Inverse folding.
């Protein structure tokens, strides 16, 4: 009973059973500061049964540094009481409550308990109870630029899925007598040692088809072994194998046991000696707070730092830690103790929320057990960070001024950022910017662009939007929401409903870009990413890229004159199937789904467009005849969609649907088997229908079958929609109409000058003139996956399953069909939070203007397996041109709007290079091999005039530059690469 | 010398190499064992992304070292 | 992209292939028109076939779209001109030039492959009644690829 209209993208990550079990779990959250509120938000969006909050501490001003559900009107009120009302709106299926008193026994009501901003003694008291009652316990902490997470799910945690990957399946060619399984040609199984597999459809070895899993010994990328199958047979041919994933038993240790000998999770392998330091440092922080009435060390205080280091040494001695304490790092932990950054809160909250989901659903591999993280490379170095600058000023930014100082706050307040996209990452980024105080100064500004509208499924991870907002524009709603969060942003955000691309350069032109400080991409496709990357490279602006997919995510930074661009690297392309496989010989459900999508488009979209264009253009016939690859099929479509097969009722639509069923599931299969009989052999003697080719069988229409009836209903309804008729749904009319159907005879054909023109003219004159039909139009079917009342996914599922029945393929349900046909990208809120946190941690590095490449970090992570990794950006390649060092990416030539001959002479004289090719956009302005007359014609013209002539279009009034690509050779004739030319108009 | 490469999806790969091997040889071995073209592979060791044209000894990669094979994601 | 396309065009210009001639249409570098002469030892001998090549915006990282424009009676080419060639769907690696693609298309024309057909009826005729296939191919080339 999961609402698939809301959890659509999340069910593709977790699944139906996982969410069903999650909807029966209670979560308690202790602490309602930035980290606690982040965790509670993510948990509420995920869809747990209920959330309970406990934080009786009254609100303070500094708490607003990362708490976005608190306002300055709430000072002096308990945080949970003021946060519950705003958390109860995120999801209507998740109640949110507040408890004013916590007792140990009460903890038995909850499936998971999350603890933040709690001293170590209380944490030990809570864990001593949760551990022995089998309650999942998570404890998180965020101190300045440092963070920690601890998980303890009990001694007998059962993990059903460990990596979150689909089970591997494959087609076998042969299985020898010793279990050596071999894949088909050029196919990799992808298994590892110790995996379990089960076989089916194996000929010669029936025993392997029982379903019992067997061990796997990967002997190579194409072959593996299962053991000895002597008894079951001698050799097996063909068949399929599917991986079997077995549960695992994970044993956690209590916090009291874990303090003595912790088990670390390393987010960065470049610094593997630090987590032992942070383990002592955080315990020393707890001891210091317990010795000072729960007060953390003051910001950048030397006395408190010395006392904290004494506590650290005492703790290291007590625990018998054989570690050499790093005084600088430990005192840095002391200095930033009172820091509270929204980026760290978002990062840790995403991670902790994913851990909570793991505890409730018993899926994915959890953290085991300590996770200590730092982003100390973000500390500014161009400003004075001292005790005088880091002291609080009684404002909402104290949690950040305690780490960066007032001067860096002034630097942040003067940013002029540009955010592309307003999806999930866009909403998170806007929240982070509002909390950090970005663009709240006199010279600050934020610009956000997005051309999409809010939908029901977007509310599951885009937390700035509400059901009342469905149908509005994302950018406007996000701007209003973030203005509500931080009132200082009123009048300092501009929202556009424009798509960033070649068609919007009149709005995002030179004037717009020259004023920015940085660009942040929040897109979901590669084309827009590449376009924005090129624009930033031309204007020399920093770029922050980030992407997510299910539980995986990455973040990258592009810095002018330092690193390479986003487009300097490659990514795997999307996979497409060969046309021959889709057309005649499918062997997977994906092939049938693609064929069904093509059938839908060709039945309900293309003929309608042809008919409409015929009735609109007064002379469409000539264009169709002289342009279309198959004009006769266009004429046939027009004829039979206008006059011959035009329905006058719904019974005619049902009859048409029955005829189409016969055409596409009974007759074409008969023709194919006539061409290639099941007993046929190839030219080499091998049977034709062997391997990836499955012999089909015709389908005889049976009304009692469910798939046949589904196809008839969907096709009839879509045809009626095309012709705008009333569509029925009661099965009685369908049964009555289809009962009195007499199929026309069909016999496969064996095949065997001016007639074709005669037929075309006969069809042409049969068409009624457009004059007789004025105002009559047919409605094409525009594919829409998210609507469940248009019969689109229903038709695709029915057609795909019928074609699977033709070729004996396992049919897929409507859920998988929607996932495959709709090209849905799985999405999560926790991954979005993590990527936003990482991007905002890099943003402060960009603001500080760091000039070294070892200080920036590109991040990758997978939350299903708990993997985090960071790597320095790649420096931009250099080259030598005319004995000068030239940056390959960030350098350009600045030339006036001179003549083409003058440009060639300039390159010959200054650079000593001979120009061989010069192109602008997608046009070849000049080439060395062109005929002399053409060159003489094109030589004495200016660059702007030449571009206008070649492209046959005038330059826009707002065009202020031309980007030209030039290929030239040196004196010796060796090709030398040069940077592009920026002609100033 | 034997090294381990962990994928962002959780898979583990064992490679037999030598200290003098270049990054190109390692990428070719990974292509042989996985089918990923060398131009699309992103290898990270100790916080440094390995670049073509250099040797393993330049990155201080020793026996039983762990590399991470990562990739960029188009969603968001 | 542009540099790669210009490099390929210059390389084609240096040595006339003598069996193919590809070049940008008008001045659009990403849209080319190519010509293929029918192999001498094939039914399509003495025929000129025009192909349309559409380079993607991500060239050479995505395969170009190559479509036959002249009607051809081949088992692996349908009525829309689509070509059943592996190097153009998923085997595309940014390491081979358009000349290699044209040579592959010419080789495909010299000897069809009916074991994995794209037009089942033509493959059936080719396997069963070869002489009828030869006659049909010659007639189609005469009445479509000449003139
Ligand atoms: N070229 C572009 N210019 C501006 N905004 C863009 C562009 N391309 C995509 N976007 C926006 O980027 C955001 C991408 O985020 P996301 O993919 O999570 O949202 P969505 O596409 O609306 O949702 P879903 O993918 O779940 O159906 C969307 O707002 C999309 O409209
Ligand atoms: Mg949308
Ligand atoms: Mg999207």
């Amino acid at each position: 009973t999961i609402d698939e209209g809301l959890y659509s993208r999340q069910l593709y990550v977790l699944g139906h059973e996982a969410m069903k079990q999650m909807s029966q779990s209670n979560v308690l959250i202790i602490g309602c500061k930035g980290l606690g509120v982040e965790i509670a938000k993510n948990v509420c969006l995920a869809g747990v049964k209920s959330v309970t909050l406990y934080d009786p501490q009254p609100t303070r001003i500094e708490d607003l540094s990362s708490q976005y559900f608190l306002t300055e009107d709430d000072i002096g009120v308990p945080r949970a009481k003021v946060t519950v009302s705003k958390l109860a709106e995120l999801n209507q299926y998740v109640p949110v409550s507040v408890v004013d008193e916590l007792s140990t026994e009460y903890l038995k009501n909850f499936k998971c308990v999350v603890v933040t901003e709690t001293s170590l003694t209380k944490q030990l008291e809570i864990n001593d109870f949760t551990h022995k009652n089998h309650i999942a316990y998570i404890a998180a902490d965020s101190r300045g630029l440092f963070g920690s997470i601890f998980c303890d799910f009990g001694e007998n945690f059962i993990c059903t899925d460990t990596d979150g990957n689909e089970p591997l399946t494959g087609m076998i060619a042969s299985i020898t007598d010793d279990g050596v399984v071999t894949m088909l040609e050029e196919t990799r199984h992808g298994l590892e040692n110790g995996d379990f597999v089960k076989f089916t459809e194996v000929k010669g070895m029936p025993g392997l088809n029982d379903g019992t899993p067997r061990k796997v010994e990967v002997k190579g990328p194409y072959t593996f072994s299962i053991g000895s199958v002597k008894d079951l047979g001698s050799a097996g041919y063909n068949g399929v194998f599917t991986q079997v994933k077995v549960p695992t038993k994970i044993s956690f240790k209590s916090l009291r046991e874990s303090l003595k000998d912790p088990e670390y999770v390393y987010p960065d392998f470049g610094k593997m000696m630090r987590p032992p330091q942070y383990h002592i440092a955080f315990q020393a922080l707890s001891a210091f707070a317990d010795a000072h009435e729960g007060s953390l060390p003051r910001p950048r205080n030397d006395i408190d730092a010395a006392e904290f280091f004494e506590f650290c040494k005492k703790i290291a001695s007590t625990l018998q830690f054989d570690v050499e304490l790093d005084e600088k790092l430990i005192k840095e932990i002391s200095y930033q103790a009172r820091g509270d950054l929204v980026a760290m809160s978002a990062f840790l909250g995403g991670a902790v929320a994913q851990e909570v989901l793991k505890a409730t659903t018993s899926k994915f591999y959890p953290l085991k057990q300590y996770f200590y993280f730092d982003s100390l490379e973000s500390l500014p170095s161009s400003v004075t960070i001292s005790e005088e600058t880091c002291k609080p000023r009684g404002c909402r930014y104290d949690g950040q001024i305690a780490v960066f100082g007032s001067e860096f706050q002034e630097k942040i307040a003067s940013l002029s950022t540009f955010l592309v996209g307003a999806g999930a990452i866009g909403c998170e980024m806007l929240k982070n910017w509002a909390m950090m105080g970005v663009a709240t100064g006199e010279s600050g500004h934020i610009s956000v662009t997005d051309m999409d509208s809010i939908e029901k499924s977007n509310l599951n991870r885009q937390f700035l939007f509400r059901p009342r907002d469905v149908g509005k524009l994302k950018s406007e709603c996000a701007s209003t929401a973030v203005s509500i969060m931080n009132p200082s942003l009123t009048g300092k955000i501009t929202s556009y409903q424009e798509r960033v691309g070649p068609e919007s350069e009149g709005i995002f032109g030179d004037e717009f870009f020259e004023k920015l400080s940085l660009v942040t991409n929040a897109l979901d496709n590669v084309e827009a990413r590449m376009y924005v990357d090129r624009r930033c490279v031309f204007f020399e602006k920093p770029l922050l890229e980030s992407g997510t997919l299910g539980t995986k995510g990455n973040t990258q930074v592009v810095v002018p004159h330092l690193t390479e661009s986003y487009g300097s690297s490659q990514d795997p392309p999307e996979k497409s199937f060969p046309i021959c496989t889709l057309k005649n010989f499918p062997n997977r459900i994906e092939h049938t789904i693609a064929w069904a999508r093509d059938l839908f488009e060709g039945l309900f979209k293309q003929p309608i467009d042809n008919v409409n264009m015929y009735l609109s253009s007064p002379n469409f016939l000539e264009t169709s005849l002289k342009t279309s690859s198959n004009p006769r099929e266009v004429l046939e479509n027009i004829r039979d969609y206008l006059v011959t097969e035009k329905p006058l009722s719904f019974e005619e639509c049902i009859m048409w649907a029955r005829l189409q069923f016969d055409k596409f599931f009974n007759n074409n299969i008969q023709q194919l088997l006539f061409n290639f009989p099941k007993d046929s052999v190839t030219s080499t003697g091998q049977p034709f229908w062997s391997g990836p080719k499955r012999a089909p069988t015709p389908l005889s229409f049976d009304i009692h079958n469910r798939e046949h009836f589904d196809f008839i209903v969907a096709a009839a309804s879509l045809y009626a929609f095309n012709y705008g008729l009333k569509s029925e749904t009661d099965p009685a009319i369908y049964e009555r109409v289809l009962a009195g159907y007499n199929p026309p005879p069909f016999a496969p054909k064996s095949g065997i000058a001016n007639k074709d023109k005669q037929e075309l003219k006969s069809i042409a004159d049969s068409l009624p003139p457009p004059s007789s039909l004025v105002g009559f139009r047919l409605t094409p079917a525009e594919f829409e996956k998210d609507d469940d009342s248009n019969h689109h996914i229903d038709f695709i599922t029915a057609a795909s399953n019928l074609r699977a029945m033709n070729y004996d393929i396992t049919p897929a349900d409507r859920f998988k069909t929607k996932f495959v046909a709709g090209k849905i990208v799985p999405a999560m809120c926790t991954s979005t939070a993590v990527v936003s946190g990482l991007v905002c941690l890099e943003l402060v590095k960009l603001v500080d203007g760091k000039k070294k490449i070892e200080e920036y970090k590109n991040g990758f992570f997978n939350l299903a397996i708990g993997l985090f990794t960071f790597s320095d950006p790649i420096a931009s390649p250099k080259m030598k041109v005319n004995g000068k060092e030239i940056d390959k990416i960030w350098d350009r030539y600045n030339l006036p709007d001179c003549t083409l001959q003058e440009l060639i002479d300039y390159f010959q004289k200054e650079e000593g290079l001979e120009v061989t090719m010069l192109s602008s956009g997608v046009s070849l302005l000049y080439a060395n091999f062109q005929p002399p007359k053409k060159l003489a014609e094109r030589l004495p013209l200016k660059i702007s005039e030449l571009v206008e002539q070649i492209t046959k279009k005038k330059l826009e009034p707002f065009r202020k530059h031309l980007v030209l690509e030039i290929c030239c050779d040196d004196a010796n004739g060796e090709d030398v690469e040069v940077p592009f030319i920026c002609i100033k108009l | 010398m034997q090294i381990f490469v962990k994928t962002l999806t959780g898979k583990t790969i064992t490679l037999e190499v030598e200290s003098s091997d270049t990054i190109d040889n390692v990428k070719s071995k990974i292509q042989d064992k996985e089918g990923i073209p060398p131009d699309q592979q992103r290898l990270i060791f100790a916080g440094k992304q390995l670049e073509d044209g250099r040797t393993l000894s330049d990155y201080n990669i020793q026996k039983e070292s762990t590399l991470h094979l990562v990739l960029r994601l188009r969603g968001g | 992209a542009l540099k790669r396309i210009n490099r390929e065009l210059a390389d084609l210009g240096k040595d006339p292939p003598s069996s193919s001639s590809a070049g940008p249409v008008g001045d659009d570098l990403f849209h080319w028109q190519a010509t293929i002469m029918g192999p001498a030892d094939s039914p399509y001998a003495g025929g000129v076939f025009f192909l349309s090549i559409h380079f993607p915006t991500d060239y050479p990282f995505k395969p170009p779209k190559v479509n036959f424009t002249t009607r051809i009676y081949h088992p692996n080419i349908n009525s829309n001109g689509s070509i059943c060639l592996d190097i153009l769907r998923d085997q595309w690696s940014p390491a081979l030039t358009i000349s290699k693609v044209l040579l592959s298309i010419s080789s495909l024309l010299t000897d069809p492959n009916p074991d994995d057909p794209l037009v089942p009826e033509i493959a059936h005729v080719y396997k069963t009644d070869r002489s009828r296939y030869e006659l049909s191919a010659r007639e189609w080339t005469r009445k479509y690829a000449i003139g």
Observations:
- The domain at 1-71 of chain B is CATH 3.10.20.90 (Ubiquitin-like (UB roll)).
- The first helix of chain B runs from residue 23 to 34.
- Residues A 452, 455 surround magnesium ion (ligand 2) (CB under 6 Å).
- The interface with chain A takes residues 6, 8-12, 32-36, 39-40, 42, 44-49, 51, 66, 68, 70-76 of chain B (CB under 8 Å).
